[PDB]
Design a protein around this ligand. Structure first.
Ligand SMILES: CCCCCCCCCCCCCCCCCC(=O)OC[C@H](CO[C@@H]1O[C@H](CO)[C@H](O)[C@H](O)[C@H]1O)OC(=O)CCCCCCCCCCCCCCCCC
Ligand SMILES: CCCCCCCCCCCCCCCCCC(=O)OC[C@H](CO[C@@H]1O[C@H](CO)[C@H](O)[C@H](O)[C@H]1O)OC(=O)CCCCCCCCCCCCCCCCC
Ligand SMILES: CCCCCCCCCCCCCCCC(=O)OC[C@H](CO[C@@H]1O[C@H](CS(=O)(=O)O)[C@@H](O)[C@H](O)[C@H]1O)OC(=O)CCCCCCCCCCCCCCC
Ligand SMILES: CCCCCCCCCCCCCCCC(=O)OC[C@H](COP(=O)(O)OC[C@@H](O)CO)OC(=O)CCCCCCCCCCCCCCC
Ligand SMILES: CCCCCCCCCCCCCCCC(=O)OC[C@H](COP(=O)(O)OC[C@@H](O)CO)OC(=O)CCCCCCCCCCCCCCC
Ligand SMILES: CCCCCCCCCCCCCCCC(=O)OC[C@H](COP(=O)(O)OC[C@@H](O)CO)OC(=O)CCCCCCCCCCCCCCC
Ligand SMILES: CCCCCCCCCCCCCCCC(=O)OC[C@H](COP(=O)(O)OC[C@@H](O)CO)OC(=O)CCCCCCCCCCCCCCC
Ligand SMILES: CC1=C(/C=C/C(C)=C/C=C/C(C)=C/C=C/C=C(C)/C=C/C=C(C)/C=C/C2=C(C)CCCC2(C)C)C(C)(C)CCC1
Ligand SMILES: CC1=C(/C=C/C(C)=C/C=C/C(C)=C/C=C\C=C(C)\C=C\C=C(C)\C=C\C2=C(C)CCCC2(C)C)C(C)(C)CCC1
Ligand SMILES: CCCCCCCCCCCCO[C@@H]1O[C@H](CO)[C@@H](O[C@H]2O[C@H](CO)[C@@H](O)[C@H](O)[C@H]2O)[C@H](O)[C@H]1O
Lengths: 504, 41, 639, 44
C-alpha cells in the first residue's frame, strides 16, 4: 504493498512503454510486433489497475484513496498529487478496459503503426492522468495532453474531411482548456494561500460572484468537452471522421472527462454557483437529448449519426449532475460508464461495417445483414443497448436519472413535470433513428450494386470477442447495478450532502 | 449485496488470456479480402 | 416449500436457453445451425420444466397458500431504494400457466412450421428469450419491473417480427412495432416516475392506498392523479393495441405465424390488460380514468370488428380480431369487471392461439401449392375448400370460430357474456355497441371460416412459379398443439359460469372483495347466429353476394378496407413531420452553429491576411511607424 | 447541405437561407425561452 506508487505507475507506464516503440524490431513493416507490444502494455496496465483496485481501494471510504503527493515544483505549488476517489475509480477502470479493447480493435492499421500505437499508449497514459491527479495545474496538463495525440490520430487515419475535423478539434479544445487554466488560477489565488490541490480548493469558501465567474469558465471548458449543444459542433466532424479505435476511446473516455470534472470542480468545489446554474444545466441536458436525437435521425452518414447519438446520451449525465439527489448523481456516473461501454461497442461495429462495405451513406448498403450475420447480430444487440433496454446498462442509469430528478424537492413542481416530460421524448426518439438505420443498413433485400464491388465478409473472432467483452459488463450492470454503484455510492453521498447545504 | 472485487479479480485474468488468444484469431484483415490500411479513407 | 423459494427460476431457465444457444450461435455458428432438433429439444425441455413449475405453483395457489413474495434490493441511494423480486399471486400463477402452456405448444408447433427454414435455431433462441422476459413480466411485484420485462418483451417482439430480415415489409413492421410500443412506454415510464414521485413505493398495493391517503388530503389534486393514471394506461394502449396505438399489430403479422400466435395474439398483447389488472388498486379510485379506459376499449372493439370484416388476408383479419377482443378485455377492465376481463383474457390466448396455429397450417399447406409468396399464400380469396384437404385443421378452426363467436357452450360465450353483463349494469350506451360488434365478430369470423374451409380450391389462375396442386396435411407437430389447444377452447369456459364461478373466487379484485343472464345470453347468442347466418348466406349460398353489398356501401367499404386510413394519417402528420423536424434541426446545426464556429475561425484569418500589409517592405515607412509610436507613447503617457 | 438532402431526408427548400433562418430563430428561441423559464420558474 500500500506504500507503492500505484497511480503514478498507472499513468506513467504506458508513456514510458510508448517511448520504447521505435526501438522494437520490425522487418516486415506492417507493424505486428508493435501491435503485440501495445496490447501487452495495455493488458499489463489494466491488470495493475484492477490489482490496485481490488487490494488498496476501499468501497466504504468517501475520501481520496491510493493517495500520492510528490513535490514537483514547490515555487508555484506544482505537485504530482494523484488519488482515486469514487468519481475517479469507475472511470479509471473504464479507461483501462476501453483503451485495452481499443488497442485490440486497432489491429487492422498498417499505415503508420509505430506512430499509431505510440499515440494510443500516450493516450492510455494521459486519460487516466485526467481522472487520477488532484492538482489543478497537473489537471490542466493532463487535460491538454490529448491535444496532439487526438490531432494526429484524427488527421493521419480515418475520414475524408479529417484535416478540417482535426483542426477544429485542436483549436476548440485548446480554446476551452484556456478556461480550465483561467478558472484554476482564479480559484487557487483566492484568499491568502496558493495551494493548488483539488481537496484544498474544494475546502475553501469562495463568495458568490466569484463562484459564478469560475463556474462560467469551467462551464465553457466542460460544455465543450462534454457535448453541450451550443458548444458541440467539434464532435460530429471530429467523430464522424475517425477510425474505430480512435472513435472508441474518443467518445468512450474523452467525453467522460468533462463530466467527471463537472462533479469534481463544479459541484464539489462551487456549490453556491451550482445551485444557481443547475436549472440551466437541466435544460441543456434535455436539449442535448432531444436535439442530438433529431440530428442523429437526420444524418445520412453513419459515423456522424452515431456521433450525434453519443451527444444525445450525455444529456442524462447533465440532468443527473444538476439534480440534487443521491440517485440522480449515481445515475449520472452510471450513464458516463454505461455510455462509454455501449458507445465504444457501437463505434467498433460501425468501423467494422465500414471496413467491409467501404461506404458510410445509408442510401447505399442495403441488405448487408444477409452476408455479415454476426455484425448484424452484434450491431442489433449494441443498438438495443443504446435504446435504454432493461437488462442492459443503458436503462438503469436513465431510470435512476429520471427518478432522482423527479424526487428532487429542491425544484418546483411544474419545472420537474416539464423536464421529465421533455427528457422522456428521447425515449421515443432513440429507437426512431437507431432502428431506421438498422432497417436501412442491414435489413431488406441485398444491394447488388454494393456486393459486386466489395467483399461482404462476416466478423472475425476478434471482433466478436471485442463486442462480447463490451457487452458482458453492459448486461452485468443492467441486471445488477450495485456491481458499479457500490464503487461510488460513498463519495457521491459525500458530494450531494456537500451540495445540498446551499438550497433553501 | 455481493462485492465487485472477487468478480473483477476472477474475470480479469480470463480477459487478459482471451485478449492474448483472440489476437491470434483474425481472418479478414490479414487476408486479401481487406482492401485498406486500417485508416477509414 | 422449495418451489416457492425457487420460483425465480421460472423466468431464468428459458433465459439460459437463450444464453447458451445464442452463444452457440454467435461463436460456433457453423455448428449450432446444424443442431436444429437438439436445440429445439433443449429449449422445449427448459420450458417443459417451467411448465410444471408453473403448474405446481398454480395448483398450490388453487389449494390455498396465501400469496408469496420475495423481494431484493436492486438500485439503492440515500432514501429511494428501487426494489425488484417476484410475487406469486393467483393472477401471477394463472398468467404463469397461460404463458408456459401456450409457449410450449407454440414451440412444438414451430418444430414443424420452421422445418423448411434456415433460421430454425435462432427462432427457438428468440422464443426462449421471450418466454424468459414474459415469465418475468407476469411475476412482477413492482411497477418498475413491469417496465423492465415489459420493454424486454417489446424488444424480442421487434426481434421476432424482423425475423426474415431479407424482407422489407417485415423490417418496416418490426421497426414500427418497436416504435409504436415505445410511444406507450413513453407514458408508462412517465406515470411510473410520477407515481414514485407522488407515492414513493413502486408497489401496486402501496400506491393503491397511499394515493387514497394523498388525494383525500389537500395534497395531490385529483386531476394530477388522473393525469398520472392515464399516462400509465398509455402503456397498455400501445401493448394491447388500443385505439390510437393499434397500427403496429396488423403489420406485426409480417413475421412468422407461431409468434403471431404466441406473442401477438395470446401472451404479450394480453399483458397491457395484465398491467391494468395489476394497477387496478390505482385505477379503481378515479372514475374519469375508468371511463376513458372503458370507452377506449369499447371503441377499439368496434374499430377492430369493423376493419376485420373487409380484410382478405387470413392473418390481418385475425390481427384485427384480436384487436377487437383486447378492446373487449380493456372495456371489461374499465367498468370495474376485474374478474370478467381476466376471464376473457384466459378464454382468449387459447382459441386465438389455436386460430393462429390453424391459420399457420393453412398458410403452410398453401405454400406447398401456390408458392412461398406471402401475398398469394395468405389471401383468403384463393383458399376455398381446405376442409376436405385439411380435416383436423378445419375442425380446430371451426372450434375457435365458434369460441370467439360466443354461440355454443364453448369457452368464449361465458367470458364475453360476463363482460357484456357487467357493461350493461354499468353503461347501457356501450353495451349496445359491443353487442352489435359481437354480431359483427361472429360474422367476420365465420366469413373467414367459410372463405377458407368451404367450397373448392379456387386458386390463382395465371401463375404458380414453384406436394403441389393439392393442399396436403400439416404434420403431427403442427396439428397436435391444435388439438391440445382445442380442449381449453371448449372446456374451461365452465370455470366462469354465473353459477359456481370459480374464476371470481380465485381471481378477485384486490383490497375489499338468471332473470337477466338468460336475457343477455339470448341476445349475444342471437346476434351471433344472425352474424353466422349472414356470413352463410353471403359467402356460401350466393344471392347476397359481397360485391353488390360492397358497392352499396362502397365509401364505407373503402373506409374499412383501407383500415380507417390510420397509417396514411400517421404517414402524413407524424413520420413526415418528424423527418421534416429532424432535417430542420440538422440544417440549423450544420449552418448556424457551425457558422458561428467557422466565422470565429474565419474572422481571425482575414486580420493577418490584411494585417500583414502593415509590414509592406519599405524601411522608411517602418521608421515612420517607429517615430509615430514614440510620439503616441509620449502623448498617451502624459494624460 | 446537399449531402443531407438525400434519401429519407429529402425536402425541397430545406437548405434555403429563409427556411434555415426561420428554423434557427424557432429552435434557438425555444432554447432561450426554456433557459429563461428555468431560471425563473425553478427555484435553485
Ligand atoms: C437481455 C438483453 C438481450 C439482448 C438480446 C438481443 C439479441 C440480439 C441478437 C439478435 C439479432 C440477430 C440477427 O438479426 O440475426 C443475424 C444472424 C442470423 O443468422 C442466423 O444464424 C445462422 C448463422 O449462420 C444461420 O445462418 C441462420 O440461418 C441465420 O438465420 O444471427 C446470428 O447469426 C446470431 C443470432 C443470435 C441470436 C441469439 C438471440 C438470443 C440472445 C439472447 C441472449 C441474451 C442473454 C442475456 C442474459
Ligand atoms: C367513426 C365512424 C365509424 C363508422 C364505421 C365505418 C363502418 C365501415 C363499414 C364496415 C362494413 C364493411 O365495409 O363491410 C363491407 C363488406 C364487403 O365484403 C367484402 O367484399 C369484398 C369485395 O369487395 C370481398 O368479397 C370480401 O370477401 C367481403 O368480405 O360487406 C359486407 O360483408 C357487409 C355485411 C355486414 C354483415 C353484418 C353482420 C350482421 C350483424
Ligand atoms: C466557447 C469558447 C471556446 C473557445 C474560446 C477561445 C477561442 C479560440 C480561437 C482560436 C481560433 C484561431 C485559429 C485560426 C483559425 C483558422 O485558421 O481557421 C481554421 C479553420 C478553417 O480552415 C480550414 O482548415 C482545414 C485544414 S487547414 O490547416 O487549412 O489544415 C481545411 O481543410 C479547410 O478547408 C479550411 O476551411 O476554421 C476552424 O475550424 C476554426 C475553428 C475554431 C473555433 C474556435 C472557437 C469557436 C467558439 C464558437 C462558439 C459557438 C456557439 C454559438 C452557438 C449559437
Ligand atoms: C506525451 C507526448 C506526446 C507528444 C506527441 C508528439 C508526437 C510527435 C510525432 C512526430 C513524428 C515522430 C517522428 C518519427 C520517428 O522519429 O520515428 C520513426 C518511426 C516510424 O515508424 P512508422 O511505422 O510510422 O513508419 C511508417 C512510415 O514510414 C510510412 O508508413 O515512428 C515511431 O517510431 C513512432 C514515433 C514516436 C516518437 C515520438 C517521441 C515523442 C517524445 C516526446 C515525449 C516527451 C515526454 C517528456
Ligand atoms: C469462474 C470465473 C472465471 C470465469 C468467468 C468468465 C467465463 C468466460 C467463459 C467464456 C469464455 C470462453 C470463450 C470461448 C470461445 C472460444 O473458445 O473460441 C471460439 C471461436 C474459436 O475461433 P474459431 O476460428 O474456431 O471461430 C469459428 C470460425 O469458423 C468463425 O469464423 O472463436 C469465435 O468464434 C468467437 C467467439 C467470441 C466469444 C467471446 C469470448 C467470450 C467473452 C468473454 C467476456 C469476458 C469479459 C471480461 C470483462 C472484464
Ligand atoms: C431473469 C432476470 C435475471 C436473473 C434474475 C434472477 C437471478 C438469481 C436470483 C438470485 C438468486 C439468489 C440465490 C439464493 C437462493 C434463493 O434464491 O433462495 C431464495 C432466497 C432465500 O433463501 P433462504 O436460504 O433464506 O431460504 C429461506 C429460509 O426459509 C430457508 O433458509 O431469497 C432471496 O434471496 C431473494 C431472491 C429474489 C430474486 C428475485 C429476482 C427477480 C427475478 C426475476 C423475476
Ligand atoms: C395522438 C398520438 C397517438 C398516435 C401516435 C402514432 C405514432 C405511431 C408512429 C408509427 C410510425 C413508426 O413507428 O415509424 C417510425 C417513424 C419514423 O419513420 P422511419 O423513417 O424511421 O421508417 C419509415 C416508416 O414509414 C416505417 O418504418 O417514427 C415516427 O415518426 C414516430 C413519431 C413520434 C410518435 C408520435 C408522437 C406524438 C407526439 C405528439 C406531439 C408531436 C410532437 C411535436 C414536436 C414539435
Ligand atoms: C387520443 C386520446 C388517447 C391518447 C393517446 C396517446 C397515445 C396520445 C399521446 C401522445 C404523446 C406521445 C404526447 C407527446 C408529446 C410530446 C411533444 C409535446 C414534444 C415536444 C418536444 C419539444 C417541443 C422539443 C423541443 C426540441 C426541438 C424543437 C428541437 C431541438 C431542441 C428542443 C429540445 C428545443 C386515449 C388512449 C387517452 C383515449 C382518449 C383519446
Ligand atoms: C471492467 C470494468 C468494471 C467491471 C465490470 C465487471 C464487474 C462486469 C460484470 C459482469 C457480470 C458478472 C456478468 C454477468 C452476466 C453476463 C451476461 C449474462 C453476458 C451475456 C452475453 C450474451 C450471451 C451475449 C450474446 C451475443 C453477444 C456476444 C453479441 C451479440 C449477439 C448475442 C447477444 C447473441 C466496472 C465495474 C468499472 C464497469 C466497467 C468495466
Ligand atoms: C540514453 C540516454 C539518452 C537518451 C537519448 C534518447 C534517444 C535514444 C537513442 C536513440 C538513438 C538510437 O536510435 C537507433 O537508431 C535509429 C536512429 O537512426 C533507429 O533505428 C530504426 O531504424 C529504422 C528506421 O529508421 C527502423 O526500421 C528500425 O526498426 C529502427 O531500429 C532507432 O531510433 C534506434 O534503433
Amino acid at each position: 504493498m500500500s506504500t507503492f506508487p500505484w497511480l503514478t505507475t498507472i499513468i506513467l507506464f504506458p508513456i514510458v512503454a510508448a517511448l520504447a516503440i521505435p526501438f522494437i524490431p520490425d522487418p516486415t513493416g506492417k507493424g505486428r510486433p508493435i501491435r503485440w507490444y501495445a496490447l501487452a502494455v495495455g493488458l499489463i496496465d489494466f491488470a495493475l489497475i484492477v490489482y490496485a483496485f481490488t487490494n488498496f481501494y476501499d468501497l466504504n471510504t468517501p475520501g481520496m484513496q491510493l493517495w500520492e503527493s510528490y513535490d514537483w515544483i514547490p515555487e508555484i505549488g506544482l505537485r504530482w498529487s494523484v488519488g482515486a476517489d469514487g468519481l475517479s475509480m469507475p472511470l479509471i477502470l473504464l479507461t483501462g478496459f476501453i483503451t485495452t479493447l481499443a488497442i485490440l480493435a486497432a489491429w487492422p492499421v498498417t499505415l503508420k503503426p509505430r506512430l499509431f500505437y505510440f499515440l494510443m499508449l500516450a493516450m492510455y497514459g494521459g486519460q487516466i492522468a485526467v481522472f487520477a491527479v488532484q492538482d489543478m495545474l497537473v489537471f490542466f496538463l493532463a487535460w491538454e495532453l490529448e491535444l496532439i495525440p487526438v490531432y494526429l490520430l484524427l488527421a493521419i487515419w480515418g475520414g475524408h474531411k479529417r484535416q478540417y475535423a482535426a483542426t477544429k478539434f485542436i483549436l476548440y479544445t485548446a480554446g476551452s482548456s484556456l478556461f480550465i487554466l483561467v478558472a484554476g488560477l482564479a480559484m487557487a489565488f483566492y484568499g491568502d494561500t496558493v495551494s493548488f490541490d483539488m481537496q484544498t480548493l474544494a475546502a475553501k469558501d469562495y463568495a458568490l460572484g466569484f463562484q459564478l465567474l469560475v463556474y462560467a469558465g469551467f462551464l465553457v471548458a466542460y460544455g465543450v468537452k462534454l457535448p453541450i449543444v451550443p458548444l458541440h459542433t467539434w464532435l460530429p466532424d471530429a467523430h464522424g471522421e475517425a477510425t474505430a479505435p480512435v472513435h472508441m476511446l474518443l467518445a468512450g473516455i474523452l467525453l467522460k472527462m468533462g463530466g467527471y470534472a463537472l462533479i469534481r470542480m463544479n459541484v464539489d468545489m462551487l456549490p453556491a454557483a451550482h445551485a444557481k446554474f443547475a436549472p440551466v444545466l437541466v435544460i441543456l441536458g434535455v436539449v442535448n437529448i432531444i436535439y442530438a436525437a433529431l440530428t442523429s435521425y437526420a444524418q445520412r452518414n453513419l459515423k456522424r449519426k452515431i456521433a450525434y447519438s453519443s451527444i444525445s446520451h450525455i444529456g442524462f449525465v447533465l440532468i443527473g449532475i444538476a439534480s440534487f439527489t443521491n440517485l440522480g448523481m449515481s445515475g449520472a456516473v452510471l450513464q458516463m460508464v454505461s455510455h462509454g461501454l455501449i458507445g465504444a461497442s457501437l463505434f467498433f461495429l460501425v468501423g467494422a461495417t465500414y471496413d467491409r462495405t467501404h461506404t458510410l451513406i445509408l442510401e447505399e448498403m442495403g441488405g448487408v445483414g444477409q452476408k455479415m450475420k454476426k455484425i448484424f447480430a452484434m450491431f442489433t444487440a449494441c443498438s438495443l443497448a443504446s435504446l435504454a433496454l432493461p437488462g442492459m446498462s443503458g436503462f438503469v442509469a436513465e431510470l435512476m436519472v429520471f427518478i432522482g430528478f423527479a424526487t428532487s424537492d429542491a425544484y418546483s413542481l411544474p419545472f420537474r413535470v416539464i423536464v421529465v416530460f421533455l427528457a422522456a421524448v428521447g425515449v421515443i426518439l432513440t429507437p426512431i433513428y437507431l432502428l431506421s438505420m438498422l432497417r436501412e443498413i442491414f435489413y431488406g433485400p441485398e444491394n447488388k450494386e454494393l456486393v459486386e464491388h466489395e467483399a461482404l465478409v462476416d466478423a472475425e473472432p476478434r471482433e466478436v470477442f471485442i463486442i462480447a467483452c463490451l457487452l458482458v459488463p453492459i448486461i452485468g450492470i443492467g441486471l445488477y447495478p450495485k456491481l458499479l454503484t457500490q464503487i461510488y455510492d460513498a463519495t457521491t453521498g459525500q458530494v450531494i450532502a456537500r451540495a445540498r447545504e446551499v438550497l433553501p | 449485496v455481493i462485492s465487485v472485487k472477487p468478480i473483477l479479480l476472477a474475470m480479469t485474468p480470463v480477459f487478459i488470456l482471451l485478449c492474448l488468444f483472440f489476437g491470434t484469431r483474425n481472418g479478414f484483415y490479414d487476408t486479401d479480402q481487406y482492401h485498406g490500411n486500417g485508416s477509414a479513407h | 416449500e422449495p418451489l416457492y423459494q425457487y420460483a425465480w427460476l421460472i423466468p431464468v431457465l428459458p433465459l439460459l436457453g437463450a444464453l447458451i444457444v445464442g452463444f452457440g450461435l454467435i461463436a460456433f455458428s457453423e455448428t449450432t445451425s446444424k443442431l436444429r432438433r437438439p436445440s429445439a429439444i433443449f429449449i422445449m425441455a427448459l420450458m417443459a420444466i417451467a411448465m410444471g413449475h408453473s403448474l405446481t405453483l398454480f395448483w398450490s395457489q388453487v389449494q390455498g397458500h396465501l400469496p408469496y413474495t420475495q423481494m431484493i434490493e436492486w438500485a439503492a441511494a440515500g432514501n429511494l431504494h428501487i426494489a425488484m423480486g417476484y410475487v406469486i399471486d393467483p393472477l401471477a400463477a394463472l398468467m404463469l400457466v397461460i404463458v408456459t402452456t401456450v409457449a410450449f405448444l407454440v414451440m412444438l408447433y414451430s418444430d414443424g412450421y420452421m422445418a423448411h427454414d434456415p433460421g430454425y435455431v435462432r427462432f427457438f433462441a428468440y422464443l426462449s428469450l421471450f418466454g424468459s422476459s414474459m415469465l418475468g413480466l407476469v411475476v412482477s411485484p413492482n411497477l418498475v419491473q413491469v417496465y423492465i420485462f415489459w420493454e424486454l418483451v417489446g424488444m424480442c417482439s421487434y426481434l421476432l417480427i424482423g425475423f426474415w430480415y431479407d424482407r422489407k415489409s417485415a423490417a418496416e413492421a418490426a421497426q414500427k412495432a418497436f416504435v409504436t410500443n415505445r410511444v406507450g412506454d413513453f407514458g408508462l415510464l412517465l406515470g411510473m416516475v410520477g407515481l414514485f414521485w407522488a407515492t414513493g413505493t413502486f408497489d401496486f398495493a402501496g400506491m393503491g392506498d397511499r394515493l387514497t391517503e394523498l388525494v383525500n388530503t389537500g395534497l395531490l389534486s385529483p386531476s394530477l392523479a388522473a393525469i398520472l393514471a392515464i399516462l400509465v394506461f398509455l402503456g397498455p394502449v400501445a401493448k394491447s393495441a388500443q385505439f390510437p396505438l393499434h397500427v403496429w399489430l396488423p403489420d406485426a403479422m409480417e413475421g412468422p405465424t407461431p409468434i403471431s400466435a404466441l406473442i401477438h395474439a395470446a401472451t404479450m398483447v394480453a399483458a397491457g390488460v395484465f398491467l391494468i389488472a395489476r394497477m387496478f388498486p390505482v385505477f379503481e379510485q378515479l372514475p374519469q380514468v375508468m371511463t376513458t379506459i372503458a370507452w377506449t376499449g369499447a371503441f377499439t372493439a368496434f374499430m377492430g370488428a369493423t376493419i376485420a370484416i373487409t380484410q382478405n388476408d387470413i392473418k390481418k383479419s385475425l390481427a384485427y380480431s384480436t384487436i377487437s377482443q383486447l378492446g373487449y378485455m380493456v372495456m371489461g377492465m374499465g367498468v370495474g369487471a376485474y374478474s370478467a376481463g381476466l376471464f376473457h383474457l384466459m378464454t382468449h390466448a387459447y382459441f386465438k392461439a389455436m386460430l393462429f396455429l390453424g391459420s399457420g397450417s393453412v398458410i403452410h399447406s398453401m405454400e406447398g401449392v401456390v408458392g412461398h409468396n406471402p401475398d398469394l399464400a395468405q389471401d383468403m380469396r384463393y383458399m376455398g375448400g381446405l376442409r376436405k384437404y385439411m380435416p383436423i385443421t378445419g375442425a380446430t378452426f371451426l372450434v375457435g370460430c365458434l369460441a370467439i363467436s360466443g354461440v355454443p357452450p364453448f369457452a368464449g360465450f361465458w367470458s364475453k357474456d360476463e363482460i357484456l353483463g357487467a357493461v350493461f349494469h354499468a353503461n347501457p350506451a356501450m353495451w349496445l355497441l359491443t353487442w352489435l360488434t359481437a354480431g359483427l365478430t361472429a360474422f367476420y369470423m365465420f366469413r373467414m371460416y367459410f372463405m377458407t374451409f368451404e367450397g373448392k380450391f379456387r386458386n390463382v389462375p395465371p401463375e404458380r412459379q414453384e406436394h403441389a396442386a393439392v393442399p396436403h396435411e400439416s404434420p403431427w407437430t403442427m396439428t397436435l398443439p391444435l388439438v391440445v389447444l382445442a380442449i381449453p377452447s371448449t372446456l374451461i369456459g365452465f370455470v366462469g359460469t354465473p353459477f359456481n364461478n370459480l374464476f371470481e373466487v380465485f381471481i378477485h379484485a384486490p383490497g375489499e372483495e338468471l332473470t337477466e343472464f338468460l336475457i343477455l345470453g339470448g341476445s349475444s347468442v342471437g346476434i351471433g347466429l344472425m352474424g353466422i347466418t349472414v356470413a352463410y348466406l353471403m359467402y356460401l349460398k350466393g344471392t347476397p353476394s359481397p360485391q353488390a353489398i360492397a358497392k352499396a356501401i362502397q365509401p364505407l367499404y373503402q373506409f374499412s378496407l383501407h383500415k380507417w386510413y390510420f397509417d396514411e394519417l400517421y404517414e402524413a402528420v407524424f413520420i413526415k413531420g418528424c423527418r421534416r423536424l429532424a432535417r430542420q434541426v440538422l440544417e440549423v446545426d450544420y449552418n448556424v452553429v457551425d457558422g458561428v464556429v467557422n466565422l470565429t475561425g474565419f474572422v481571425t484569418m482575414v486580420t493577418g491576411e490584411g494585417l500583414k500589409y502593415l509590414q509592406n517592405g519599405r524601411a522608411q515607412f517602418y521608421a515612420l511607424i517607429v517615430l509615430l509610436a514614440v510620439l503616441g507613447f509620449v502623448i498617451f503617457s502624459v494624460q | 447541405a446537399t449531402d443531407f438532402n438525400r434519401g429519407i431526408m429529402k425536402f425541397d427548400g430545406a437548405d434555403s437561407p429563409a427556411m434555415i433562418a426561420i428554423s434557427a430563430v424557432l429552435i434557438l428561441g425555444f432554447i432561450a425561452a426554456l433557459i429563461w423559464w428555468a431560471l425563473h420558474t425553478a427555484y435553485a
